[PDB]
Amino acid sequence: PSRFTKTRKHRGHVSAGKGRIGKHRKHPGGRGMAGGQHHHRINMDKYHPGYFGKVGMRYFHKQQAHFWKPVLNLDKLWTLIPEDKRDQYLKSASKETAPVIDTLAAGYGKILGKGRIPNVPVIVKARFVSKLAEEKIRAAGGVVELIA
Amino acid sequence: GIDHTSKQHKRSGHRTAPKSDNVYLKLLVKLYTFLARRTDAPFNKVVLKALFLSKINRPPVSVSRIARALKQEGAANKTVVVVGTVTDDARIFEFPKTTVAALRFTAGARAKIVKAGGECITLDQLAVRAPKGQNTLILRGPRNSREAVRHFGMGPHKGKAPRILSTGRKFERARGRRRSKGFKV
Amino acid sequence: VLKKNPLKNKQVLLRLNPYAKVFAAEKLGSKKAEKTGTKPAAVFTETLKHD
Amino acid sequence: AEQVAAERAARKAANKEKRAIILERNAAYQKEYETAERNIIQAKRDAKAAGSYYVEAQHKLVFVVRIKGINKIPPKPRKVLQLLRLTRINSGTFVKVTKATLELLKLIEPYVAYGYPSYSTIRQLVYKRGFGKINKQRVPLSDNAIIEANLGKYGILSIDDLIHEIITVGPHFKQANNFLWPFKLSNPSGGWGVPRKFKHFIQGGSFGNREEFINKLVKSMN
Amino acid sequence: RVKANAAKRAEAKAQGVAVQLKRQPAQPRESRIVSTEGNVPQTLAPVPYETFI
Amino acid sequence: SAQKAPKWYPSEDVAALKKTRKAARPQKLRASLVPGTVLILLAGRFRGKRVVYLKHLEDNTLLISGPFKVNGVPLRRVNARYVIATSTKVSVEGVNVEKFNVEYFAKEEIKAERVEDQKVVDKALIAEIKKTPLLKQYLSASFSLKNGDKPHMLKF
RNA sequence: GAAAUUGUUGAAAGGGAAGGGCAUUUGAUCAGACA
RNA sequence: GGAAUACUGCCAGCUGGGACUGAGGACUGCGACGUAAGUCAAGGAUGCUGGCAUAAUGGUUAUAUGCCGCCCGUCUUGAAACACGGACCAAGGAGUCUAACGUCUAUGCGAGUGUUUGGGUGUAAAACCCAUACGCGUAAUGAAAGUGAACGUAGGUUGGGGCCUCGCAAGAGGUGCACAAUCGACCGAUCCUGAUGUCUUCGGAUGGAUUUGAGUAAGAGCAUAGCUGUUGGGACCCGAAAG
RNA sequence: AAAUAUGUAAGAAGUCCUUGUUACUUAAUUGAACGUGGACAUUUGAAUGAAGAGCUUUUAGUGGGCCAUUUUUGGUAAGC
Numbered sequence A: 001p002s003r004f005t006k007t008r009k010h011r012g013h014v015s016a017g018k019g020r021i022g023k024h025r026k027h028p029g030g031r032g033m034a035g036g037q038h039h040h041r042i043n044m045d046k047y048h049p050g051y052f053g054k055v056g057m058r059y060f061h062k063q064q065a066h067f068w069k070p071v072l073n074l075d076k077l078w079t080l081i082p083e084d085k086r087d088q089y090l091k092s093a094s095k096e097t098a099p100v101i102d103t104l105a106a107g108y109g110k111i112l113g114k115g116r117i118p119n120v121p122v123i124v125k126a127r128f129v130s131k132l133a134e135e136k137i138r139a140a141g142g143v144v145e146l147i148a
Numbered sequence B: 001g002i003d004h005t006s007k008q009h010k011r012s013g014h015r016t017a018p019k020s021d022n023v024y025l026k027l028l029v030k031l032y033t034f035l036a037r038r039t040d041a042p043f044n045k046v047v048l049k050a051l052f053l054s055k056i057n058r059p060p061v062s063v064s065r066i067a068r069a070l071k072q073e074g075a076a077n078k079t080v081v082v083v084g085t086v087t088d089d090a091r092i093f094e095f096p097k098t099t100v101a102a103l104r105f106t107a108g109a110r111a112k113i114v115k116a117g118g119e120c121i122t123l124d125q126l127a128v129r130a131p132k133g134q135n136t137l138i139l140r141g142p143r144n145s146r147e148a149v150r151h152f153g154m155g156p157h158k159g160k161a162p163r164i165l166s167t168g169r170k171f172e173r174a175r176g177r178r179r180s181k182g183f184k185v
Numbered sequence C: 001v002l003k004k005n006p007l008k009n010k011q012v013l014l015r016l017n018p019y020a021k022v023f024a025a026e027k028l029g030s031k032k033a034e035k036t037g038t039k040p041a042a043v044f045t046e047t048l049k050h051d
Numbered sequence D: 001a002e003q004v005a006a007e008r009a010a011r012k013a014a015n016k017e018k019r020a021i022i023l024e025r026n027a028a029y030q031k032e033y034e035t036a037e038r039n040i041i042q043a044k045r046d047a048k049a050a051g052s053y054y055v056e057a058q059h060k061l062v063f064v065v066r067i068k069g070i071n072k073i074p075p076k077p078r079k080v081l082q083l084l085r086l087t088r089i090n091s092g093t094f095v096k097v098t099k100a101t102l103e104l105l106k107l108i109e110p111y112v113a114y115g116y117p118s119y120s121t122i123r124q125l126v127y128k129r130g131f132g133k134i135n136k137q138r139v140p141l142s143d144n145a146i147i148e149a150n151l152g153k154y155g156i157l158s159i160d161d162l163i164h165e166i167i168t169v170g171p172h173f174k175q176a177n178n179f180l181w182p183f184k185l186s187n188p189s190g191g192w193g194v195p196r197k198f199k200h201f202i203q204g205g206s207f208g209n210r211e212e213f214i215n216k217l218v219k220s221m222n
Numbered sequence E: 001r002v003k004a005n006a007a008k009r010a011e012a013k014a015q016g017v018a019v020q021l022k023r024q025p026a027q028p029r030e031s032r033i034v035s036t037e038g039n040v041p042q043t044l045a046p047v048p049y050e051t052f053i
Numbered sequence F: 001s002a003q004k005a006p007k008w009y010p011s012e013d014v015a016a017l018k019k020t021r022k023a024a025r026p027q028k029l030r031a032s033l034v035p036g037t038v039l040i041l042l043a044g045r046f047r048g049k050r051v052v053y054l055k056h057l058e059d060n061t062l063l064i065s066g067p068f069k070v071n072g073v074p075l076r077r078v079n080a081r082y083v084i085a086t087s088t089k090v091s092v093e094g095v096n097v098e099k100f101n102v103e104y105f106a107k108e109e110i111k112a113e114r115v116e117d118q119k120v121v122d123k124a125l126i127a128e129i130k131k132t133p134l135l136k137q138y139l140s141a142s143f144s145l146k147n148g149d150k151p152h153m154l155k156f
Numbered sequence G: 001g002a003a004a005u006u007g008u009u010g011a012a013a014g015g016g017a018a019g020g021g022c023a024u025u026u027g028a029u030c031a032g033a034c035a
Numbered sequence H: 001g002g003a004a005u006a007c008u009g010c011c012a013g014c015u016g017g018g019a020c021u022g023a024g025g026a027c028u029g030c031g032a033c034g035u036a037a038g039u040c041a042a043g044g045a046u047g048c049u050g051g052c053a054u055a056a057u058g059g060u061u062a063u064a065u066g067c068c069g070c071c072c073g074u075c076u077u078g079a080a081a082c083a084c085g086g087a088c089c090a091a092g093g094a095g096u097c098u099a100a101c102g103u104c105u106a107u108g109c110g111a112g113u114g115u116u117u118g119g120g121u122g123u124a125a126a127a128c129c130c131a132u133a134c135g136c137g138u139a140a141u142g143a144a145a146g147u148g149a150a151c152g153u154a155g156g157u158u159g160g161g162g163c164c165u166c167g168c169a170a171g172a173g174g175u176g177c178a179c180a181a182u183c184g185a186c187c188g189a190u191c192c193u194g195a196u197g198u199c200u201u202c203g204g205a206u207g208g209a210u211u212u213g214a215g216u217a218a219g220a221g222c223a224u225a226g227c228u229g230u231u232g233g234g235a236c237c238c239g240a241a242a243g
Numbered sequence I: 001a002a003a004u005a006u007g008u009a010a011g012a013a014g015u016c017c018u019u020g021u022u023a024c025u026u027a028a029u030u031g032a033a034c035g036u037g038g039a040c041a042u043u044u045g046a047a048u049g050a051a052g053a054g055c056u057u058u059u060a061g062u063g064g065g066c067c068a069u070u071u072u073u074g075g076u077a078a079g080c
């Protein structure tokens, strides 16, 4: 609110806190991103290394979607089972009856392996897996079932 | 005159109450300034200041970070104190008993603790139980995990993360970031 | 609240320093020194009055 | 609940006890001081008799007054005037003399007046204008408990005990002397004795080592 | 200075202390009595201007 | 309201005074003030009158009298710092003066006792004055600075 | 029914500007406290 | 020969004259004097007396007198300037709002978070309620195809508040979050190594390297709001010659 | 070959002893680096000072300068 603003305080001093010598003028540096490669290059290399020129390949008509594939680490995974249903399985961890987890259904695309899942068996349905992901799962005596 | 040798009328630079405007916080502070003026226990002195701290200097402590501290040799029966909120961490699968004294407890954090039959205690309750902070473990959270501190100290050869908005190939990955496009950083 | 100077306020002169009482009692501040008369060597004089 | 006079007793009596120790102490130094003096006086005479020359020990202690104001001072002497705690005109502090402070003095001759202070003038500097540094603050002396409180750790439980540590450059001169806030003198009363202050004493000015004439000055400023 | 300082620390300690091993600055001179026997002072004056040339 | 009430008021309880340490000790007078001494009155009703000094009263005032029958000045109080003490002195060992104190001059025309007292004292003095010749004249004539006189230099 | 600016009346000052600062005389004017 | 004196210095020796000041508001301290009771100049003025009680002291104002005092605003090394604007007075008269942002802070909730496109509802542009999505966050790296974060108690060393144990205390040991320093391990890129095998060219285990990343290593974010700062906009207000 | 200026050092991150680790290195369990275990506390290692020390973020104005002593270049010189 205007009330708490510094111009209210500058009323009565000549230069509005913009200086007697160097004034406040329209556009001294030029406008915009002007001078990038000249009188503003020190600020652009440092703060913005990498700004000018090109790198890899163009991709005409890229459709994000094509590449839709969220990740879920073993880190969680057990989260995708409802709270109450969860403790049910952690104790009584077994083959013959082990939880099915449809990670696709939970809206994930690949399972990665960030760390340590208890030795409960899980049946894990995914589109993709980290080689470790699958490994670790197996070490608890569960498997991975590839879907779509 | 006086050849001064140090800047005159300098404020000490430390907060002195909180900037915050919450009655309850202002009461907790009323409590601990008393205990710190009148008990000479160091603990009370530390806490009084942590109450003044702002939201950034109060990163959250997670129940799993809590579980780990109790894992310390000799420490399982201590009561962890947190001058901040405590949050939940589904990544730990086995949470201990104990007694956590904090400012806020998130819904799930409070549940996790209690579900293992532990206790969640407010600071004033902690005070009545332990006016010298007897048998207490103070925990602070990771301050320089903030996203912001990523961009501090940006310069050549510092490795620090552009303040950048859109962010893919062809956003600041060219001349100045690789040997084949001018030079590298 | 108000600094009083011992050098002229007998009361506090005697507050700090109790020796002050006997110092004055025994004059002391005008102590008469032992009257001896050693004479200096002609050597010493000769060279004092030399050119 | 006693303490009516009950702990007033075990206190006032205990207070009497200290004055006792101060009393015998102050009686001692007085012995110390005059026999020390007399001894020199007879040294000088004995040598004359013997056809010899008694050269005194050079002075162990000086007293420095800042004489120049606060403007237009070059940096190196400016630092030193800070280190000797002379940062305001006419203030003074005691300095124990060694190679390593003597050179300090050399650096600031144009800005100060110093010399060898007598017992008389150390005594009245301390009684009249002497203050301690206590959690900073600067606290008038005026009671002996103020000293014992802070300097007592090192022996030294009275104002005369202070003085004694100073004048004899004691084993604990550094703490004894730092404890004393820089003295704050007025301008001389008689005047400066000279028409221009900022030449050396030896050239009819005021600055530099003016030796035992330091007392005449300070006494007119204290 | 250290190897020396550890020395006279043992040579002290294991005797009955009187340590004293910090360096001190040049101290001013003590009193002394200078004699005259074989040494009476010779009196010098300043000397007149002259030109050698 | 036209003004919010304050949130705090002063208390209207007055304090007691700290216990001051100021003993009222007696005024010793300058050595020139011994009784029987003639005084010059520097100020007042009887300014420049030459007058006999009689007794230091308990309110530090000086008790003097003309004598009234010489110069008109009665038994009176006079302040010691408004008086030049001369060197000329009459003996006053015949004058009672015991009677006269502060209450004797308490305001509370002239009471016959005053008019009587004046005669009893003055008679004793006159008896004495008459011994040294010209005193009575001296006593009866005003002092004044004549051109030239420099007080810081004159003997009185 | 402001101000610039004007008329009259009253008071005051004025030897090549006026106006201002500290201080007090003098004139005019007025608050308060006392009981 | 034996004194005096000058000169310099000392005395917690005595004593006169004069000026300014009187902060504080029970008591509490350190002392001094006395055989003692008491007393006191000892942690800041009291006693005694007079005059007026009102324009008398005091405020204000005008004038006079002593000393002093150039015209402001601006740009400038430098202005009272023989630099510029301003004869006078009123009224108007210049850092804004918006999009998207950095840092900081307050508040909600927290591995999440954001009701307000929309629906429901209403005392109707409000307040109240809400399904599905979506956005940012919870993963990085590579030009890309692609691959994708525990040797270990999520490591060792050193400092480290706090807390724990002993001790009367001084201290000694135990544990040590944040933070800092340092050496390592993990993920991707680069380079090398190329096992068990194979639709004989596929596959790429495993162990490495002065390489390299805006990474992991018991999450900190999302949202609203504020001051300051940033970019675009008439962009603090007035101004070209021109197109 | 000065004077004035100028680098480093004046300890617990120190000194000493016993003897582990390795793919480096040695003729060599030789060395080198990093260690485990043990011995000596504040006269623990000059002075003076220290209204404390360290650290982080973000942002203004500024980017015409002029003068004096001393050193000093150009110029006969200069209020150059």
Ligand SMILES: [Mg+2]
Pocket (backbone or CB within 6 Å): none
């Ligand atoms: Mg705004």
Ligand SMILES: [Mg+2]
Pocket (backbone or CB within 6 Å): A001, A002, A003, A004
């Ligand atoms: Mg407002």
Ligand SMILES: [Mg+2]
Pocket (backbone or CB within 6 Å): A003, A004, A008
């Ligand atoms: Mg305002």
Ligand SMILES: [Mg+2]
Pocket (backbone or CB within 6 Å): A009, A010
């Ligand atoms: Mg301002």
Ligand SMILES: [Mg+2]
Pocket (backbone or CB within 6 Å): none
């Ligand atoms: Mg201001």
Ligand SMILES: [Mg+2]
Pocket (backbone or CB within 6 Å): A009, A010, A011, A012, A013
């Ligand atoms: Mg203003």
Ligand SMILES: [Mg+2]
Pocket (backbone or CB within 6 Å): A013
């Ligand atoms: Mg300003």
Ligand SMILES: [Mg+2]
Pocket (backbone or CB within 6 Å): A017, A018, I060
């Ligand atoms: Mg500004």
Ligand SMILES: [Mg+2]
Pocket (backbone or CB within 6 Å): A014, A015, A019, A020
């Ligand atoms: Mg301007």
Ligand SMILES: [Mg+2]
Pocket (backbone or CB within 6 Å): A051, A052, A053
């Ligand atoms: Mg570009």
Ligand SMILES: [Mg+2]
Pocket (backbone or CB within 6 Å): A073, A075, A114
């Ligand atoms: Mg994760």
Ligand SMILES: [Mg+2]
Pocket (backbone or CB within 6 Å): none
């Ligand atoms: Mg992150």
Ligand SMILES: [Mg+2]
Pocket (backbone or CB within 6 Å): D084, D094, D095, D096, I048
């Ligand atoms: Mg010193």
Ligand SMILES: [Mg+2]
Pocket (backbone or CB within 6 Å): D189, D190
């Ligand atoms: Mg004098």
Ligand SMILES: [Mg+2]
Pocket (backbone or CB within 6 Å): none
């Ligand atoms: Mg004079």
Ligand SMILES: [Mg+2]
Pocket (backbone or CB within 6 Å): none
């Ligand atoms: Mg004189």
